[PDB]
Amino acid sequence: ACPESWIGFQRKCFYFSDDTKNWTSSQRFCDSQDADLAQVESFQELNFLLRYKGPSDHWIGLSREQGQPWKWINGTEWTRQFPILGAGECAYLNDKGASSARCYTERKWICSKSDI
Amino acid sequence: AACPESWIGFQRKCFYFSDDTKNWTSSQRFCDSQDADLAQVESFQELNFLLRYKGPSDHWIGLSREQGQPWKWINGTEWTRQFPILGAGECAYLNDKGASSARCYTERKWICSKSD
Ligand SMILES: *[C@@H]1O[C@H](CO)[C@@H](O)[C@H](O)[C@H]1NC(C)=O
Ligand SMILES: *[C@@H]1O[C@H](CO)[C@@H](O)[C@H](O)[C@H]1NC(C)=O
Ligand SMILES: *[C@@H]1O[C@H](CO)[C@@H](O)[C@H](O)[C@H]1NC(C)=O
Ligand SMILES: *[C@@H]1O[C@H](CO)[C@@H](O)[C@H](O)[C@H]1NC(C)=O
């Protein structure tokens, strides 16, 4: 189903970290579990993540270089559903939704993978 | 999907977190109608999962006791005492930090669980 301790929602499995890492180290961790930093594709998914995450900021799998659009982990372009606030290069969830920061900062993170 | 729509997956079970309130027996009747029971909360890990997702309101769980007698799960087995339960009530609920107890006729949100 989902691996031990991962949380199941709709067709995905989610890992919420206890520790903090920078964004690229977080994605390296997710990749080691055949997963990615969360690819949050829907409002229902966003709301599930906000409800479980607790008060800490958590990285998700959206990033950009300056003067380049937001990209998913696979390098394709993100199209807005919910907004990502600010001017940072890496995206995370705070208590109101998505925000952006410098990629070198340490936050908690969320991994996702398919349940299949 | 491992669980029905609106249910959350954890450790091979599916969890339902209510929006409305009911007394404890009426909550159990609702779970029963969905082929489930009020959540058993067998482990400390399950306790923490439920506290993280439930939100700020009190939620009934599937433990109850008669006058000065041990706590029992819905299924009739004696509780394995894996966390403290505060107070002097006959029905257990989760508050924001752990488990407590109240009179069974009082109204609260509830959590159901079933195998996936
Ligand atoms: C890339 O990832 C995004 C987000 O999960 C997905 O919508 C898109 O279909 C994927 N594209 C490819 C070519 O895999
Ligand atoms: C990200 O963190 C790792 C340590 O986990 C470190 O090796 C690397 O220097 C960091 N990258 C940046 C941009 O700070
Ligand atoms: C009763 O439920 C508990 C709590 O989940 C479970 O661990 C135990 O096996 C059950 N007992 C019986 C007799 O089914
Ligand atoms: C519990 O609530 C139900 C209806 O929701 C009601 O029929 C019953 O009287 C209540 N039980 C107690 C002990 O008050």
Check which CATH number belongs to the domain holding B23 and give it.
3.10.100.10
d(CA B55, CA A59): 22
The b/e string for A38-76 (b: 16+ C-beta within 10 A; e otherwise) is bbbeeeebbebbbebbeebbbbbbbbbeeeeebebbeee
Q: Decide if B114 contacts B10 (C-beta within 8 A).
A: no
Ligand at minimal distance from the CA of A25 is 2
Nearest CA in chain A to B15: A8
Ligand 4 midpoint to CA B38 (Å): 16
For residues A116 and A73, give the distance between their C-alpha atoms in angstroms, rounded to a whole number.
19
Q: What are the φ and ψ backbone dihedral angles of B101, each rounded to 5 degrees?
A: -145, 150
Report the run of H or E that residue B99 belongs to, with start and end.
strand B99-102
Distance (angstroms) between ligand 1 centre and the Cα of B60 equals 41
Q: Strands A108-114 and A12-16, how do they pair?
A: antiparallel
Question: Can you tell me the distance from the alpha carbon of B49 to that of A40, in angstroms, rounded to the nearest whole number?
Answer: 21
Number of Cβ within 10 Å of residue A90's Cβ equals 24
Q: How far from A9 is each of A95, A113, B9, B41, CA to CA, in Å?
A: 19, 11, 6, 20
Alpha-carbon dihedral sign for residues A100, A105, A109, A114: positive
Domain that holds residue A91: 1-116
Method of structure determination? X-ray
Q: How many domains does chain A have?
A: 1
Report phi then psi at A33, rounded to 5: -105, 25
For residue B11, the 8-state DSSP code is T
A20's CB contacts (< 8 A; 6+ apart) are A106, A107, A108
In whole angstroms, what is the distance from residue B75 CA to residue B77 CA?
A: 6
CA A56 to the chain's CA centroid: 13
* Ligand 2 pocket, residues with Cβ under 6 angstroms: A 21-22, 24-25, 103-104
Q: How far apart are CA B73 and CA B38, in angstroms?
A: 9
Ligand 4: which of B26, B30, B32 to mutate, most ligand atoms within 8 Å of CB?
B26
A54 contacts on B by Cβ (under 8 Å): 52
